[PDB]
């Protein structure tokens, strides 16, 4: 009767109306607070992704074998059941999974019988007895898993991750005020490439990250890094190009940055840095450097060494002096110096040919020079400023600038 | 009582707001578990497609003459009982008829008496004892037939369809993985224009495909052809401009396709092409090119030759860097570049003006260049990308894009 009512309520035309796209460019069916899953949903065979939100007491029949085009499944706060042919087909076909476990049993135990699964989004919450979740440590049956994002209050990294380290590549964890401990389980990461830890309350960068020899990127988001003294072993991460240590508390930057020069992306926005050293800009391979909403007193001239830089953000600083050597670096595509204590925009600014973005918003300026026409890639949108600074171009320069 | 009750609760007004449109932009209405056709349905005069789907043994009344615009009927598991005046009205008006059935008795015998019928679609297995290609012997009465889709899992094309093929212009066969015994028996349908062998699992091209001279569009969808080797003989097909070889095990493209210079809509997607070669770009007439879900090593420079290219689709293929020769062409309109390993998008996209949509979600895209704002036709719906990467753009150009979007 429940199946008959499910098929009667939702016609396929209503499902055509419900058809939409998602965050991964798949055909999504958003099903919200339903009594069950209709067979009319499975009658659609062009479907690429299923979204089931708080549809509990639901048993997946063999009829999902109709739709071969599935790649993503969103099983959100719903206790789902299974059938043998469904196990076989979703072992063969399903690869992307995004579940929310508001309740531990609202996580179903059958995610782990699959092998073709590649992406996993483990949003939700966890209790004190973290290691007892045998549901986590069954991903040994998963062979193709490559994306794992666990938004949960996880204090201890499970031995699950230790087992699945051979093929896993991306971590995204949001503890939200919960301290993360037991970092040997992240030490025995071997083939991992991406690590995004948010609010893990990691006081220091562990030797776990340096045990990783193939980490493409690292995120220490919302982690109270007061000092950075363990960078000496960061040279072992030759694949490390991204260091997004933003909203952090790094008070000063030492010489240890010379250990790794393969670093390319460097986000220290809202950091506690007071003065930059002479030793950041030695690593010329850096292209993507962020100091947004910091409080740097001034910029020393050694910035001239960073030629391959394409992004230099120091916005909302206390910087009163920009020396002309950053204007000498012409490969600097983005350069954000907004809301600093600077005085006058540089007249010889047209020398920067490849200057795509110059965020200098809220800076105390007086009059724009006429050489913005010499700048090939700077716009009013790019040079975001207060409007009384926009009104300053000569009339012929307005004629040449309204036509770019 | 059932008919009158069905007239009552399903009144004409809610049915009027029930009206919808198809891919042909024709007014439909889907009737789904109805006892019969309500008279309120037949009262409608603007109807174009009437969908009698799963209507149990409904008798069609003469009031179908009220459906003056009626041209399309899709009898999906719905045996239609009809009489002489409704028969005359359908013979003089109705022109397209997609009969889906699961039994020979479900197929009505009057559908072979319609004069003006030109599009006819069958779904359901047709191989049976003492009825193989005999029930459709009335197709000779139908002289206006131009489209004949047979999703019938048939093992061989019927000879009555071959005599029909003198006036048939379109023949699409769906066999669901069953090899159809060609034996070069399609040489009779010299009038055939669109041979779309869907899921035929041929694994080869018979000589009848390039023996007929009238095919413009030849889509061998899921024909499982390992090596695309019969393309040299397609140059005699001056009409051929759409050769969609998708859903196959083509592992390499031989250089010989450079013979076919007339191709425009070469859709070669969802395959294991290791690389499209430079000689593939020898067809400068190529306007629509689909290579999505493929194993390309990269995208070569001779793409600059294809000045007529509008939508190049290499989604979820293996392209690490975008060549500037891609941007040398200015006619690009729909760039399916998402889910790739594009390190960065060059600023030369600012040259593109015809680009009204570009798929940039996923990838290894470091940032979106400001030159994307230089494109006038591009908007937020056109520029599908992640929220943070979109936020990397300056605020005012994003405001410009927003204002051009909403209006």
mmCIF file of C-alpha atoms in Angstrom, chain A residues 163-315:
data_model
loop_
_atom_site.group_PDB
_atom_site.id
_atom_site.type_symbol
_atom_site.label_atom_id
_atom_site.label_comp_id
_atom_site.label_asym_id
_atom_site.label_seq_id
_atom_site.Cartn_x
_atom_site.Cartn_y
_atom_site.Cartn_z
ATOM 1 C CA UNK A 163 43.565 1.307 6.711
ATOM 2 C CA UNK A 164 42.261 3.316 3.752
ATOM 3 C CA UNK A 165 45.315 5.596 3.532
ATOM 4 C CA UNK A 166 46.609 3.732 0.452
ATOM 5 C CA UNK A 167 43.943 5.130 -1.894
ATOM 6 C CA UNK A 168 42.501 8.127 -0.013
ATOM 7 C CA UNK A 169 43.519 11.597 -1.202
ATOM 8 C CA UNK A 170 41.366 14.404 0.274
ATOM 9 C CA UNK A 171 40.407 15.242 3.889
ATOM 10 C CA UNK A 172 37.946 17.931 4.985
ATOM 11 C CA UNK A 173 37.092 17.893 8.705
ATOM 12 C CA UNK A 174 35.024 20.508 10.581
ATOM 13 C CA UNK A 175 35.216 19.775 14.303
ATOM 14 C CA UNK A 176 33.561 23.106 15.285
ATOM 15 C CA UNK A 177 35.250 23.653 18.644
ATOM 16 C CA UNK A 178 36.242 20.026 19.245
ATOM 17 C CA UNK A 179 39.891 19.250 19.953
ATOM 18 C CA UNK A 180 41.450 16.705 17.594
ATOM 19 C CA UNK A 181 43.876 14.277 19.245
ATOM 20 C CA UNK A 182 45.627 10.951 18.532
ATOM 21 C CA UNK A 183 47.525 12.207 15.484
ATOM 22 C CA UNK A 184 49.452 8.981 14.834
ATOM 23 C CA UNK A 185 46.363 7.899 12.892
ATOM 24 C CA UNK A 186 47.183 10.826 10.609
ATOM 25 C CA UNK A 187 50.895 9.932 10.756
ATOM 26 C CA UNK A 188 50.186 6.619 9.054
ATOM 27 C CA UNK A 189 48.743 8.489 6.104
ATOM 28 C CA UNK A 190 50.956 7.522 3.169
ATOM 29 C CA UNK A 191 49.389 8.311 -0.213
ATOM 30 C CA UNK A 192 47.174 11.222 0.908
ATOM 31 C CA UNK A 193 47.491 14.448 -1.091
ATOM 32 C CA UNK A 194 44.968 16.898 0.419
ATOM 33 C CA UNK A 195 44.357 17.678 4.098
ATOM 34 C CA UNK A 196 41.814 20.302 5.188
ATOM 35 C CA UNK A 197 41.443 20.338 8.970
ATOM 36 C CA UNK A 198 38.963 22.931 10.278
ATOM 37 C CA UNK A 199 38.645 23.814 13.987
ATOM 38 C CA UNK A 200 40.589 20.716 15.023
ATOM 39 C CA UNK A 201 42.252 22.733 17.843
ATOM 40 C CA UNK A 202 45.720 21.579 16.776
ATOM 41 C CA UNK A 203 48.121 23.774 18.754
ATOM 42 C CA UNK A 204 51.140 22.660 16.699
ATOM 43 C CA UNK A 205 51.606 21.107 13.273
ATOM 44 C CA UNK A 206 52.176 17.423 14.076
ATOM 45 C CA UNK A 207 54.892 15.171 12.713
ATOM 46 C CA UNK A 208 51.950 13.456 10.996
ATOM 47 C CA UNK A 209 51.937 16.071 8.220
ATOM 48 C CA UNK A 210 55.674 15.646 7.669
ATOM 49 C CA UNK A 211 55.301 11.863 7.637
ATOM 50 C CA UNK A 212 53.196 12.559 4.555
ATOM 51 C CA UNK A 213 55.604 12.630 1.616
ATOM 52 C CA UNK A 214 53.044 13.322 -1.148
ATOM 53 C CA UNK A 215 50.703 15.967 0.305
ATOM 54 C CA UNK A 216 49.634 18.361 -2.449
ATOM 55 C CA UNK A 217 48.037 20.802 -0.006
ATOM 56 C CA UNK A 218 47.452 21.435 3.690
ATOM 57 C CA UNK A 219 44.757 23.405 5.516
ATOM 58 C CA UNK A 220 45.022 24.141 9.239
ATOM 59 C CA UNK A 221 41.765 26.102 9.324
ATOM 60 C CA UNK A 222 40.579 27.561 12.647
ATOM 61 C CA UNK A 223 43.560 25.893 14.326
ATOM 62 C CA UNK A 224 45.319 27.915 17.033
ATOM 63 C CA UNK A 225 48.804 28.064 15.550
ATOM 64 C CA UNK A 226 50.465 30.592 17.854
ATOM 65 C CA UNK A 227 53.958 29.787 16.542
ATOM 66 C CA UNK A 228 55.297 27.947 13.502
ATOM 67 C CA UNK A 229 58.504 26.145 14.496
ATOM 68 C CA UNK A 230 58.017 22.647 13.026
ATOM 69 C CA UNK A 231 58.365 23.819 9.399
ATOM 70 C CA UNK A 232 61.856 22.251 9.290
ATOM 71 C CA UNK A 233 60.341 18.898 8.315
ATOM 72 C CA UNK A 234 57.858 20.568 5.920
ATOM 73 C CA UNK A 235 60.578 20.208 3.264
ATOM 74 C CA UNK A 236 59.575 16.528 3.072
ATOM 75 C CA UNK A 237 56.290 17.659 1.470
ATOM 76 C CA UNK A 238 57.720 18.332 -1.980
ATOM 77 C CA UNK A 239 54.192 18.190 -3.429
ATOM 78 C CA UNK A 240 53.074 20.933 -1.028
ATOM 79 C CA UNK A 241 52.141 24.046 -2.996
ATOM 80 C CA UNK A 242 49.171 25.235 -0.902
ATOM 81 C CA UNK A 243 49.527 26.431 2.707
ATOM 82 C CA UNK A 244 46.177 28.039 3.564
ATOM 83 C CA UNK A 245 46.912 29.050 7.159
ATOM 84 C CA UNK A 246 44.288 31.807 7.283
ATOM 85 C CA UNK A 247 42.291 33.274 10.228
ATOM 86 C CA UNK A 248 45.352 32.112 12.151
ATOM 87 C CA UNK A 249 47.537 33.475 14.956
ATOM 88 C CA UNK A 250 51.043 33.298 13.478
ATOM 89 C CA UNK A 251 52.733 36.206 15.280
ATOM 90 C CA UNK A 252 55.982 36.293 13.253
ATOM 91 C CA UNK A 253 57.375 34.357 10.293
ATOM 92 C CA UNK A 254 60.819 32.729 10.780
ATOM 93 C CA UNK A 255 63.623 31.637 8.444
ATOM 94 C CA UNK A 256 62.337 28.040 8.304
ATOM 95 C CA UNK A 257 60.290 28.973 5.212
ATOM 96 C CA UNK A 258 63.517 28.358 3.265
ATOM 97 C CA UNK A 259 63.054 24.604 3.818
ATOM 98 C CA UNK A 260 60.418 24.391 1.061
ATOM 99 C CA UNK A 261 60.474 26.491 -2.110
ATOM 100 C CA UNK A 262 57.923 24.424 -4.083
ATOM 101 C CA UNK A 263 55.266 26.334 -2.106
ATOM 102 C CA UNK A 264 52.917 28.164 -4.484
ATOM 103 C CA UNK A 265 49.659 29.018 -2.656
ATOM 104 C CA UNK A 266 50.199 30.863 0.630
ATOM 105 C CA UNK A 267 47.154 32.076 2.584
ATOM 106 C CA UNK A 268 47.976 33.875 5.834
ATOM 107 C CA UNK A 269 44.863 36.057 5.846
ATOM 108 C CA UNK A 270 43.870 37.523 9.237
ATOM 109 C CA UNK A 271 47.179 36.356 10.710
ATOM 110 C CA UNK A 272 48.970 37.831 13.721
ATOM 111 C CA UNK A 273 52.063 38.686 11.648
ATOM 112 C CA UNK A 274 53.663 41.999 12.609
ATOM 113 C CA UNK A 275 56.607 42.387 10.192
ATOM 114 C CA UNK A 276 57.415 40.160 7.236
ATOM 115 C CA UNK A 277 61.023 38.905 7.227
ATOM 116 C CA UNK A 278 63.652 38.931 4.520
ATOM 117 C CA UNK A 279 63.176 35.189 4.179
ATOM 118 C CA UNK A 280 59.660 34.651 2.807
ATOM 119 C CA UNK A 281 60.389 35.985 -0.664
ATOM 120 C CA UNK A 282 63.444 33.787 -1.259
ATOM 121 C CA UNK A 283 61.092 31.013 -2.437
ATOM 122 C CA UNK A 284 60.540 32.457 -5.912
ATOM 123 C CA UNK A 285 58.109 29.701 -6.959
ATOM 124 C CA UNK A 286 55.433 31.312 -4.750
ATOM 125 C CA UNK A 287 52.670 32.805 -6.917
ATOM 126 C CA UNK A 288 49.685 32.974 -4.545
ATOM 127 C CA UNK A 289 50.389 34.876 -1.301
ATOM 128 C CA UNK A 290 47.645 36.139 1.032
ATOM 129 C CA UNK A 291 47.834 38.454 4.078
ATOM 130 C CA UNK A 292 44.254 39.737 3.977
ATOM 131 C CA UNK A 293 42.911 41.634 7.007
ATOM 132 C CA UNK A 294 46.255 41.412 8.854
ATOM 133 C CA UNK A 295 47.983 44.264 10.708
ATOM 134 C CA UNK A 296 51.443 44.476 9.107
ATOM 135 C CA UNK A 297 53.211 47.732 9.967
ATOM 136 C CA UNK A 298 55.148 48.089 6.696
ATOM 137 C CA UNK A 299 56.427 46.183 3.661
ATOM 138 C CA UNK A 300 60.214 45.750 3.430
ATOM 139 C CA UNK A 301 61.735 45.968 -0.066
ATOM 140 C CA UNK A 302 62.852 42.295 -0.309
ATOM 141 C CA UNK A 303 59.445 41.724 -1.963
ATOM 142 C CA UNK A 304 61.413 42.428 -5.149
ATOM 143 C CA UNK A 305 62.686 38.841 -5.099
ATOM 144 C CA UNK A 306 59.182 37.385 -5.660
ATOM 145 C CA UNK A 307 58.991 37.730 -9.427
ATOM 146 C CA UNK A 308 56.954 34.601 -10.227
ATOM 147 C CA UNK A 309 54.322 35.901 -7.785
ATOM 148 C CA UNK A 310 50.896 36.308 -9.376
ATOM 149 C CA UNK A 311 48.922 37.147 -6.206
ATOM 150 C CA UNK A 312 50.023 39.353 -3.304
ATOM 151 C CA UNK A 313 47.193 40.115 -0.862
ATOM 152 C CA UNK A 314 47.912 42.229 2.211
ATOM 153 C CA UNK A 315 44.484 43.873 2.448
#
